[PDB]
Structure formats: structure tokens, C-alpha cells
């Protein structure tokens, strides 16, 4: 069954000889399993999808159920239009029936296929849910100890469940999320790195929304487990764990407080110096949404020694990380006490702030000018605006602020002149 032509597959499948159909279907599976350019469109245009879908229901020929399930899985892994052709052929209810198959390799293929269909977008995700996929999927995980399940089997179930949690506009149905969450929490405590990664991705999707969505996750008590996974050595685990933590601190201050209470701030010395750029960027973004909170939360950032790390990323990092650092500083100076803002200057924030006014990015200039104003406002309540003016001048910041009076964007130049007439005049 190696390297048949599509025409040969068609004559086999049209033969109405079940065994001839099995061999042609396996031939199609092997075509669709090759690395270089699987002929997905040729298979579709040959009209084979409804035949494959019909084969999913031949319970007394389990080999042709498996071969057609595999074939349809790989078609559904193509373009949106190729996934649509699988759905258009009636595959969703047929694959859901296959979840009850006594053959583990067959139900696994059905899990995989539905994951591909749900992974196309929110419409097919919700259609898979409407056909009732969740109950049979969760039933496959109703065992006392996940460790007794096959590793590949468990990984495929976790990945498909995460695709049912994925996408916005709209987010998944509330009652579907509530139904899935207890099983997700259990997978989040499993000891397989790939299960953990996909579990964290699912939690990161569920927390990417309004505070009500975040609350649903937070009240399951997963935040301490997320913080532990924040410290993992596997980058495929840290990345979604950090994204989930970052999403949660976009919620309320009380939701942010649970992240702090769980000990997340102690991981950020590593995260803010992490060699992977996106980790540094996402860690600094998370910090910016913590320095936007209450003064007692800003104080936790101070107590954990994280201000020097913010000075560090501002001083040298990828520019997108530096922009998140600028936001973190403006949020800090906006909501912080005078004492906290003083500490920021004592840690050396002024010079790397001034250097970033050189940047070809209009909004980071806006962000930095805001922070300078907030620091000056704290300096006036101390009568120490002259000392700050000297500092800003000594490091070349005044030269840059006055150059930005010449700036194209409107409130860049207005803000830069207000600074100079109020503090440097």
C-alpha cells in the first residue's frame, strides 16, 4: 500500500469489496502521512471524504475505522478549507461515536481528529462542543490515577482539551469551561512534561479574557501550581505558565494578590534575566501589571529586590522588552508612594530612562515622559526638583527632552516643553 496513485485509491474505495476498500484506505493514509506535500486537495477533489467518514462507522472492521480516522485526521490538519471539508462530510458526530471504541488506538485517533477540528477556530470548536464531545472525552480520563494511562494517549487527550479551551470572539461556553476545568486541574498536576505544557496552554487560554473568566480559573486553586511550573527547567512549560500568570495579573488587585501570595515574585530574578527574549518580555509585561496595582503590591515588588532587575532590563534588553519595562516604571511611578518613587531613583532608573528617549517609537517616549513627570511630582513634595533636574542633565537627558520639543507627534512635544518650562527654566 506504499505510494499508490489517487486514481488507484479511488477504484479501490469504489470497489464495494470491504477488504479492497481497507487496502485503498490504508494507501490513502500513507499518502497523507508523507513529509513532502501530502496530496490533501487531490484526495478531497476525488470525493473520498464521505467514504472515509462512512468507514468510521464500520464497527466490525476496526482496521478500516483506524485507517480512515487517521486519513481524516491528516486532512483536517491542513488549511481551514481542508478542515471544513472534513466537517462538511459529517465527521464530527462520527468521530464522537468513535470515542467509545474499545480499541485504544482508535479512540485516540478520534481524540486527535476532534482536536484538529476544534483547533481550526471558535466556530468549529463550539460545533464540536454542541455535538457533545466533552462528556466522552472527559470519560476517557475518569481514572483514579492518570499514570495508568498510556503516555501518548494522555498527551493527545490533553492537547485536544486545550484546543477546546482555545480562541476568543467568542471564548468557549461558560458551562463547557466549568465542565472541563476539574479535569484540567488534574492534568496540571501530572508529571509528564508535555501534558504539563498543554495543560498550561489551556489555562493560559482560559485566563485570556475578562475578570469573570480569570476568577473561574483562580478559584480552582491552580495559582500555586502555576507558580511552581513557572520555576520548571523546561522552556515549553515556563512559556505557557508565565503567560497564564501574566493573564491573571491583568485581572483585579485581589486576583493579582493571589499570584503574589503564591510566591511568584521570587521567580522573577530568573525570568527577568532569562536568555530567551520572549520570556524576558513576558516577565516584564507581567511586572508592569503588578506595578499597576496597590501600593502594598508595589512594596512587595520592592521587597523581593525586583527594582534593580527592572533597572537592568531598561538598561539592556531587546527593545520590545525595554518598552514593557518603560510601562512598568510609569505604572510604578503613577501609583507609588513618594518613598517608593525615591527608591526607584536611588536604584538608578534615571539614566537608562533618558537613554531610551533616543528611541524611534512614539509611544515609549510618551510612556517615559509620563514617568519623568510622576518622578518630578514626587520630587516637588520633597523640594528636591533641582537635584533631579541636575541628574537628568548630567546624563544627557535634558538634551534629549529638548530635542523632543522638535518631535512630530503632538503630545510628545507638548509634554516635553511642559517638563522644560516647569523644571529646567
Amino acid at each position: 500500500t506504499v505510494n499508490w496513485s489517487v486514481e488507484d485509491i479511488v477504484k479501490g474505495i469504489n470497489s464495494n469489496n470491504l477488504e479492497s476498500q481497507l487496502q485503498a484506505t490504508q494507501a490513502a493514509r500513507k499518502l497523507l502521512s508523507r513529509e513532502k506535500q501530502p496530496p490533501i486537495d487531490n484526495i478531497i477533489r476525488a470525493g473520498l471524504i464521505p467514504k472515509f467518514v462512512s468507514f468510521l462507522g464500520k464497527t466490525d472492521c476496526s482496521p478500516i475505522q483506524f485507517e480512515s480516522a487517521w486519513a481524516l485526521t491528516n486532512i483536517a490538519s491542513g488549511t481551514s478549507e481542508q478542515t471544513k471539508a472534513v466537517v462538511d462530510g459529517g465527521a464530527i458526530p462520527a468521530f464522537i461515536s468513535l470515542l467509545a471504541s474499545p480499541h485504544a488506538h482508535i479512540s485516540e485517533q478520534a481524540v486527535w481528529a476532534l482536536g484538529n477540528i476544534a483547533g481550526d477556530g471558535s466556530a468549529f470548536r463550539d460545533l464540536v462542543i454542541k455535538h457533545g464531545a466533552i462528556d466522552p472525552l472527559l470519560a476517557l480520563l475518569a481514572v483514579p490515577d492518570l499514570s495508568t494511562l498510556a503516555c501518548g494517549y494522555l498527551r493527545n487527550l490533553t492537547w485536544t482539551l486545550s484546543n477546546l479551551c482555545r480562541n476568543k470572539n467568542p471564548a468557549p461556553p461558560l458551562d463547557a469551561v466549568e465542565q472541563i476545568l476539574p479535569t484540567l486541574v488534574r492534568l496540571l498536576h501530572h508529571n509528564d512534561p508535555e501534558v504539563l505544557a498543554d495543560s498550561c496552554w489551556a489555562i493560559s487560554y482560559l485566563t485570556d479574557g475578562p475578570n469573570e473568566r480569570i476568577e473561574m480559573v483562580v478559584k480552582k486553586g491552580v495559582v500555586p501550581q502555576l507558580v511552581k511550573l513557572l520555576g520548571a527547567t523546561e522552556l515549553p512549560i515556563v512559556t505557557p505558565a508565565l503567560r497564564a500568570i501574566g493573564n491573571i495579573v491583568t485581572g483585579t488587585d485581589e486576583q493579582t494578590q493571589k499570584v503574589i501570595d503564591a510566591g511568584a515574585l521570587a521567580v522573577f530574578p530568573s525570568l527577568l534575566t532569562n536568555p530567551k527574549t520572549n520570556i524576558q518580555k513576558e516577565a516584564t509585561w507581567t511586572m508592569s501589571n503588578i506595578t499597576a496595582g496597590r501600593q502594598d503590591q508595589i512594596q512587595q515588588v520592592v521587597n523581593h529586590g525586583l527594582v534593580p532587575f527592572l533597572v537592568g532590563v531598561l538598561s539592556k534588553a531587546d527593545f520590545k522588552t525595554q518598552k514593557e519595562a518603560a510601562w512598568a516604571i510609569t505604572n510604578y511611578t503613577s501609583g507609588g508612594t513618594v518613598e517608593q518613587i525615591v527608591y526607584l531613583v536611588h536604584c538608578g532608573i534615571i539614566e537608562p530612562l533618558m537613554n531610551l528617549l533616543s528611541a524611534k517609537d512614539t509611544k515609549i517616549i510618551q510612556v517615559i515622559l509620563d514617568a519623568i513627570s510622576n518622578i518630578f511630582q514626587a520630587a516637588e513634595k520633597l523640594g528636591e526638583t533641582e537635584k533631579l533636574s541636575i541628574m537628568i542633565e548630567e546624563c544627557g537627558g535634558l538634551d534629549k527632552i529638548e530635542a523632543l520639543q522638535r518631535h512630530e507627534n503632538e503630545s510628545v512635544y507638548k509634554a516635553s516643553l511642559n517638563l522644560i518650562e516647569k523644571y529646567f527654566s
Binding site: 485526521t73 490538519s77 491542513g78 484538529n116 483547533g119 484546543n163
Partner: peptide
Amino acid sequence: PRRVRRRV
């Protein structure tokens, strides 16, 4: 963006 996996 879509999240799909081909079985090789």
C-alpha cells in the same frame, strides 16, 4: 491562528 497536528 490555528492549532492543528498532522500524524506522520
